Amino acid sequence: PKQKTHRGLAKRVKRTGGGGLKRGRAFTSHRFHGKTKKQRRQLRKASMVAKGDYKRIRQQLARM
Amino acid sequence: ARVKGGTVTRKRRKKVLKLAKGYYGSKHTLFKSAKEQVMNSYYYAFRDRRQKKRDFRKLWIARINAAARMNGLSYSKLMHGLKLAEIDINRKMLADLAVNDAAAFTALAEQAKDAL
Amino acid sequence: MKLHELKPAEGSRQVRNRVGRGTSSGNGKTAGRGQKGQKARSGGGVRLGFEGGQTPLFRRLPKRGFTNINRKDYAVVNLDTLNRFEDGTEVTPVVLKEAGIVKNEKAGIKVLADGELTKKLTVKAAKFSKSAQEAIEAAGGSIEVI
Amino acid sequence: PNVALFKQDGTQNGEITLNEEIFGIEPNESVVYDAIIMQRASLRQGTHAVKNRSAVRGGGRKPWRQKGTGRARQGSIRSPQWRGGGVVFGPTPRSYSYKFPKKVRRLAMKSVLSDKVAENNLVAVEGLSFDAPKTKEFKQVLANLSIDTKVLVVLENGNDFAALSARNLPNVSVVTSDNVSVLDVVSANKVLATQTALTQIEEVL
RNA sequence: GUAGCGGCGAGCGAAACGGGAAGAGCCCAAACCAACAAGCUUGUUGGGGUUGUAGGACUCCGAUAUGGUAGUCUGUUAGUAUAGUUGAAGGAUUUGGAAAAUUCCGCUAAAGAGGGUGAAAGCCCCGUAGACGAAAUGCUGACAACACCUAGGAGGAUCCUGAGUACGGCGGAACACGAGAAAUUCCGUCGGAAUCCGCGGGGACCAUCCCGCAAGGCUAAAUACUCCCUAGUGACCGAUAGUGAACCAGUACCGUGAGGGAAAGGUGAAAAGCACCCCGGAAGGGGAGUGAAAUAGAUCCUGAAACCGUGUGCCUACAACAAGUCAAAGCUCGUUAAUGAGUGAUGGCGUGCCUUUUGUAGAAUGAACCGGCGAGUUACGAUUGCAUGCGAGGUUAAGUCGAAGAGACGGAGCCGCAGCGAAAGCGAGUCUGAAUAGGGCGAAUGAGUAUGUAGUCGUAGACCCGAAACCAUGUGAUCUA
RNA sequence: UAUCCGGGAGUCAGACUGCGAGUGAUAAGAUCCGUAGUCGAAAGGGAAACAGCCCAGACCACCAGCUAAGGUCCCAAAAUA
RNA sequence: GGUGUAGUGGUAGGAGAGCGUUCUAAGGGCGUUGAAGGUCGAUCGUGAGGACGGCUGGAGCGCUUAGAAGUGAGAAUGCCG
RNA sequence: UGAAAUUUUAGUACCUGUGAAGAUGCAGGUUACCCGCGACAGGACGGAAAGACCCCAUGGAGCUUUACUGUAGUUUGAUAU
Ligand SMILES: [K+]
Ligand SMILES: [K+]
Ligand SMILES: [K+]
Ligand SMILES: [K+]
Ligand SMILES: [K+]
Ligand SMILES: [K+]
Ligand SMILES: [K+]
Ligand SMILES: [K+]
Ligand SMILES: [K+]
Ligand SMILES: [K+]
Ligand SMILES: [Mg+2]
Ligand SMILES: [Mg+2]
Ligand SMILES: [Mg+2]
Ligand SMILES: [Mg+2]
Ligand SMILES: [Mg+2]
Ligand SMILES: [Mg+2]
Ligand SMILES: [Mg+2]
Ligand SMILES: [Mg+2]
Ligand SMILES: [Mg+2]
Ligand SMILES: [Mg+2]
Ligand SMILES: [Mg+2]
Ligand SMILES: [Mg+2]
Ligand SMILES: [Mg+2]
Ligand SMILES: [Mg+2]
Ligand SMILES: [Mg+2]
Ligand SMILES: [Mg+2]
Ligand SMILES: [Mg+2]
Ligand SMILES: [Mg+2]
Ligand SMILES: [Mg+2]
Ligand SMILES: [Mg+2]
Ligand SMILES: [Mg+2]
Ligand SMILES: [Mg+2]
Ligand SMILES: [Mg+2]
Ligand SMILES: [Mg+2]
Ligand SMILES: [Mg+2]
Ligand SMILES: [Mg+2]
Ligand SMILES: [Mg+2]
Ligand SMILES: [Mg+2]
Ligand SMILES: [Mg+2]
Ligand SMILES: [Mg+2]
Ligand SMILES: [Mg+2]
Ligand SMILES: [Mg+2]
Ligand SMILES: [Mg+2]
Ligand SMILES: [Mg+2]
Ligand SMILES: [Mg+2]
Ligand SMILES: [Mg+2]
Ligand SMILES: [Mg+2]
Ligand SMILES: [Mg+2]
Ligand SMILES: [Mg+2]
Ligand SMILES: [Mg+2]
Ligand SMILES: [Mg+2]
Ligand SMILES: [Mg+2]
Ligand SMILES: [Mg+2]
Ligand SMILES: [Mg+2]
Ligand SMILES: [Mg+2]
């Protein structure tokens, strides 16, 4: 049997050209009155997956 | 394909048992009691291969001290007089002299007693 | 070669690492699993992205987007290829496939302009980019659309 | 690749030229080696098995209690540490074969034949048209051509009498211009070949 | 492992396109027609007719045709399975009990596959290649007879084209799809259509378009599997292995029973297996004798170790000693002949091995000892490195041919070469943004791919043993209530 | 020897000694931190014996020598200095 | 291949080099003038281990290269004897 | 005539001390000719038994209930027969 792809990751990341992963941000759903606007505008900007985290999830989302 | 190992084990154990000759009883017949004693024997061997030198040095020194007291001098003052007089004679040699040629040892003692 | 003189190249084939076959191998008496623990067990360890009950990275992040079932993904030809073909000729998906440039005409050929073109060409495809149109028509070719 | 054409009677008829594409190259020894190991692993059959803890006739009864006895903890009469006992892993039915790239294969063939040519261990012939399949005739042919070592005999598709004549001899392997193989050629030290067979080789390759 | 499903978790997971293997399509109800009968319809027989570029009945035009068969102990014919026959080539010297080994000269091969034969045989034997062969019963395939199917062109006036059916509601299932926006299929229940200007589907649903025509039935081939039979093969086992069982094994034995479940192979070439004599009650020995060999004589080839002894060189009854090591007197032997072997008075130093532990001599754990057995493997995938081939082109999968092979064919498909974005879409740029701004991700910087190999990961028992337990069959009231 | 990239791990029970603090009874071979060392994973020499103290880091051989801490009347080498 | 300098305690653990066993393909060679195995030897190699002899034994087995693994046991209150 | 439990090997003293903190085995000192027989039972933290007290396991089983979620039955209604 071949690998199973973690679909919860396949719905939550995206491959770049260098193989790295794009990701949405947290603290961006429902509770904004507690957050300044700098946080909100800086969190609507995506970011990239960490080194040690990609080390942990690459086997899951190997090809995707 | 299958592998049995009839001879490897037996040869490997005969080696240890040949190493274990002279050992009381089980320690020359049984591989476990032997091996447990072969390793300890090798430890003791490695350690005695150092303590050997200490022991003979100690022995030689006692002999030299005796032969010097019989001339009216001690090991320490003797050897200090020798180091003064630039006389590089090993203690093994000096003990052999004290045993066999007391006259040569006496000459060395005169040298040292002059150096002092 | 002679069968009684066979040799591989150096570094091509490596000796296996057998495990639990004495201490002086280094991989003996624990198999590189270390002392006791869930990792030191047969079928032990944990799932592949498991942080010990800590909220995993996938779960603490949001899902984004969707997939358009009617998506048109085109096969790309970047204008540095086409310096191959003799000037004045007719480029087609059939030509590109026969050459082996494009093996997967996914939705249609799209032509894009990264490299420098140096020929007249009667190129035709599903879609062109505007810079490619400019470069082709400037060299003296002619754009069409299948 | 100028190779001396002999007769079925041993006399040298002349020469034949051969493709430098095939016979003139430098041989790639790593490629030949790879092909050798692959073809032997393919001729392997891999029919060999063993009964694990599950397929073995018995078990079920825990032979005694977990506790109370002064006996070790045991869970089946047929676990690996019993006088019977299912084998832990052991062999399985297994396919050792593997294909590998066509360019490497064809380079292996070319390399082998070019090594034979460089070592002069080809022997071309015009004939091998035996009226009937007697082996002593073929042996006399080998003697005339001064062969005394192993040999592979390439033949056109149909030279049945010559194939039969060469068949029984121990020094001789026989093959029919399409079933030619790296293992066969490399095993052989010399290669007797008909000009027809060489042409068939140079058209299939 | 995509699209999707999913406490959007764990996990689950398609289909179509494409490529191939195999290839075959046929019947019926109904309209109507003819016959019978009861009681103009309506049950039975036959004819007719099976469909979607709508079809058929019905009204007119000619063929009487033409091909096929997925049938028959109708036969013949050929082959094949179940017995089998034949099937070439060597004799001597040395060793030795024996020649097949050695040496000598030869012979043979459509036969040098294998096995046996006093030891290792191309030429001794069984056989092998090859060539012949079946009275009798089956089987397979053709060929004729029989049998069954097989028509064409206009019209649609009218009639028919599968009813408690499709569908809907409620409740549940299967579809990759967990009611979810839930199409599609099926079960129970209740209700409940039209029929050619008709009906269903195209993932709620409506319209348009396209495709098809259910609610009646059959249908070979490719596919899966082996109790078995024949011919065989193995970088499978070789008596703690391999089937539980090489031996009279599902046996002996255990159990009320269901049920569980062993151990145990080898003389010798050939029994030629020890006539006869002696000790002894016999067994068992000792001679003799067979035999190449009896320390090959039924416990039978070899015959380890633990263990039990016999003798002998050295030491040992004022000594404490993880039992050795180092030094060493004396004594006795003489080697893979080299700074020899054995023993050892006496002296110095020195608290076993493993596991697990901050730390174990440990009064923490394990091991009575010896011998055998006994634990990171494989399949499919992913990734990294090393190696090879080729190179911005690298490569085939299935399947066919072919030694259970290599190899050829097979370009469908896979990766990479262009990315960015949720997506539309644009494109070496793209997205955000009013924005030529800035910033993110990317390019100009460039190298990947197929195979092998090793490390590692995942799915599978996944490293070996070890629970109490859970579930589903069954067996037990000969004990006891 | 640092950094970056990638492969593979193991370790998340620590102990004592000295100095700095807390808790403690400025008691504990106590507990918890910092700091340095040692052990762990380190044999050897001294501390009688004695992981954790003092000296010192075993690649091997030597019937060679110089030193360390610690010691020099005997056990037991060295001064009855 | 040599000279010099510096180093070579080690658990978990990582890396690299190997010895040995069974089998296979090839090459080559040894065995009734006595193979393997068994046993004793005072032998060689840095180690795993490798030879040569003596006795036993009675028929198959080594050596070189490469490959494939049921490849190495001292402990499992391990199993069988 | 003929077992068994047990058993790492054993040429198996005492005091004091040390030390994983309670020593036949380490140290220092003392005592002790070698081998047994019958008796006793202080120790070998003796044997038997992977502590039943205790704690832990995101262990199990049985049991209770105004824990959760369900359900067989009981009952009421609608609908069909
Ligand atoms: K590891
Ligand atoms: K034969
Ligand atoms: K549904
Ligand atoms: K001693
Ligand atoms: K790889
Ligand atoms: K490469
Ligand atoms: K250290
Ligand atoms: K073993
Ligand atoms: K007692
Ligand atoms: K419970
Ligand atoms: Mg929102
Ligand atoms: Mg020790
Ligand atoms: Mg390998
Ligand atoms: Mg290690
Ligand atoms: Mg161990
Ligand atoms: Mg731990
Ligand atoms: Mg462990
Ligand atoms: Mg761990
Ligand atoms: Mg939580
Ligand atoms: Mg079972
Ligand atoms: Mg078995
Ligand atoms: Mg599928
Ligand atoms: Mg014959
Ligand atoms: Mg024979
Ligand atoms: Mg002969
Ligand atoms: Mg529907
Ligand atoms: Mg319904
Ligand atoms: Mg058996
Ligand atoms: Mg046997
Ligand atoms: Mg006395
Ligand atoms: Mg005495
Ligand atoms: Mg002692
Ligand atoms: Mg103990
Ligand atoms: Mg015990
Ligand atoms: Mg339960
Ligand atoms: Mg009854
Ligand atoms: Mg200090
Ligand atoms: Mg403490
Ligand atoms: Mg501190
Ligand atoms: Mg530790
Ligand atoms: Mg120390
Ligand atoms: Mg320690
Ligand atoms: Mg000095
Ligand atoms: Mg002194
Ligand atoms: Mg080191
Ligand atoms: Mg060092
Ligand atoms: Mg063998
Ligand atoms: Mg094994
Ligand atoms: Mg054992
Ligand atoms: Mg205590
Ligand atoms: Mg004490
Ligand atoms: Mg001590
Ligand atoms: Mg008595
Ligand atoms: Mg006890
Ligand atoms: Mg316990």
PDB file of C-alpha atoms (C1' of nucleotides) in Angstrom, chain B residues 2-10, chain E residues 371-374, chain G residues 21-22 71-73:
ATOM      1  CA  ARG B   2      19.048 -21.703   6.582  1.00  0.00           C
ATOM      2  CA  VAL B   3      22.153 -21.495   8.729  1.00  0.00           C
ATOM      3  CA  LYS B   4      22.780 -23.718  11.736  1.00  0.00           C
ATOM      4  CA  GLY B   5      26.102 -22.844  13.331  1.00  0.00           C
ATOM      5  CA  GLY B   6      27.385 -26.148  14.622  1.00  0.00           C
ATOM      6  CA  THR B   7      31.098 -25.412  14.611  1.00  0.00           C
ATOM      7  CA  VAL B   8      31.333 -21.650  15.129  1.00  0.00           C
ATOM      8  CA  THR B   9      30.012 -21.794  18.669  1.00  0.00           C
ATOM      9  CA  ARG B  10      32.028 -24.842  19.663  1.00  0.00           C
TER      10      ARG B  10
ATOM     11  C1'   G E 371      24.184 -29.060  23.919  1.00  0.00           C
ATOM     12  C1'   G E 372      20.729 -27.469  20.338  1.00  0.00           C
ATOM     13  C1'   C E 373      16.695 -23.811  19.119  1.00  0.00           C
ATOM     14  C1'   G E 374      15.540 -18.716  19.784  1.00  0.00           C
TER      15        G E 374
ATOM     16  C1'   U G  21      28.656 -19.204   8.747  1.00  0.00           C
ATOM     17  C1'   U G  22      25.023 -21.462   4.705  1.00  0.00           C
ATOM     18  C1'   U G  71      24.174 -15.125   8.894  1.00  0.00           C
ATOM     19  C1'   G G  72      27.086 -15.207  14.643  1.00  0.00           C
ATOM     20  C1'   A G  73      23.721 -16.368  21.758  1.00  0.00           C
TER      21        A G  73
END
